[PDB]
A paper describes a structure:
Upon F420 binding, the kvPepI structure remains virtually unchanged, except for the stabilization of the residues 187–190 that are part of a larger flexible loop (residues 181–201). The crystal structures of PepI and PepI in complex with the cofactor F420 allowed us to identify key residues His62, Tyr122, and Gln229.
Central to this pathway is PepI, an F420H2-dependent oxidoreductase. PepI first catalyzes the formation of the central statine, then produces the C-terminal statine moiety. Among these, the homolog kvPepI from Kitasatospora viridis DSM44826, with 53.3% sequence identity to PepI, was more amenable to study. Through comprehensive structural and biochemical characterization of PepI/kvPepI, we confirmed that PepI/kvPepI sequentially reduces the middle β-ketone followed by the C-terminal β-ketone or methyl ketone.
Residue numbers in the entry: 25 to 186, 196 to 303
Write the structure that this text describes.
């Protein structure tokens, strides 16, 4: 699958730079602007409309919605509106939610991991029944969540950092698990992951050795294979992404806002 690159931007209350930041993302060659779903962050679909008004080619995605925050019928209303009024530029990533304090602040039941995944399941089923036109992404590494992505999603997002970094070998197993559940639909589902850190260096080997301090359970060799880290020159990072597309199927790669400019040269090469 051809590469698509995203940057996860945080639209921040009290800061006046949103439209400028979105323009910088598009001008730097990103294909997707991704926004999160948190209390204390701007509301995601409203922020995405503001981004759409100042950009022309990028897709806009949630990354990912906290399913506890959304009534499925009203979310379907939001998605149809975002789709029609942007001319088809909106995608919806969904997940279970994970910050308990936000559940408590909003007056919502934290429940159990099982009830939070069931809410995601119920919402995905309802959105598909309502035939929402926005492509749907499902994120998260749990068995049930990957099973729901296999059933319902256009894009599956694998998490590489739980932060505890997951090894390439554990990611091999998660991708294979997803593929087995997807069965005949596997070829129809785009695979995404978020790179947490983009570390520009002329000595990737010395860099990985120093990073063992923050990841003691890993060898330097494992660190250089972590899907959530990109280390080296732009050319080395492009080669790494080519290898990881072959290994994991990852063609939709997102980075964090702080690394927007660091990663842009890799887009130039790929």
């Amino acid at each position: 699958r051809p590469f698509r690159f995203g940057v996860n931007l945080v639209p921040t209350p009290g800061v006046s730079s949103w439209r400028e930041t979105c323009r910088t993302a598009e001008q730097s060659g990103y294909d997707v602007i991704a926004v999160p779903d948190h209390l204390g962050v701007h509301s995601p679909f409203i922020a995405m409309m503001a981004a759409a008004a100042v950009t022309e080619r990028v897709q806009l995605t949630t990354f990912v919605l906290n399913s506890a925050f959304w009534n499925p019928v009203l979310l379907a209303r939001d998605l149809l509106t975002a789709h029609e009024l942007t001319g088809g530029r909106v995608e919806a990533g969904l997940g279970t939610g994970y910050v308990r304090a936000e559940f408590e602040t909003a007056g919502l039941d934290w429940g159990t991991a099982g009830t939070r995944v069931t809410r995601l399941a119920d919402t995905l089923a309802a959105l598909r029944t309502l035939a929402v036109p926005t492509p749907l992404m499902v994120g998260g590494n749990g068995d049930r969540v990957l099973g729901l992505a296999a059933e319902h999603a256009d894009t599956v997002s694998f998490s590489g950092a739980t932060l505890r970094m997951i090894t390439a070998e554990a990611m091999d197993e998660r991708v294979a698990f997803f593929a087995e559940r997807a069965g005949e639909r596997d070829s129809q589902v785009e695979r995404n992951t978020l790179v947490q850190s983009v570390i520009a260096t002329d000595d990737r080997a010395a860099t990985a050795k120093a990073m063992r301090s923050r990841m003691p359970y890993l060898t330097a060799e494992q660190i250089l294979q972590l899907p959530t880290l990109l280390i080296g020159t732009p050319a080395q990072m492009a080669e790494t992404l080519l290898e990881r597309r072959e290994r994991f199927g990852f063609s939709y790669v997102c980075v964090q806002e702080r690394y927007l400019a660091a990663f842009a040269p890799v887009i130039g090469l790929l």
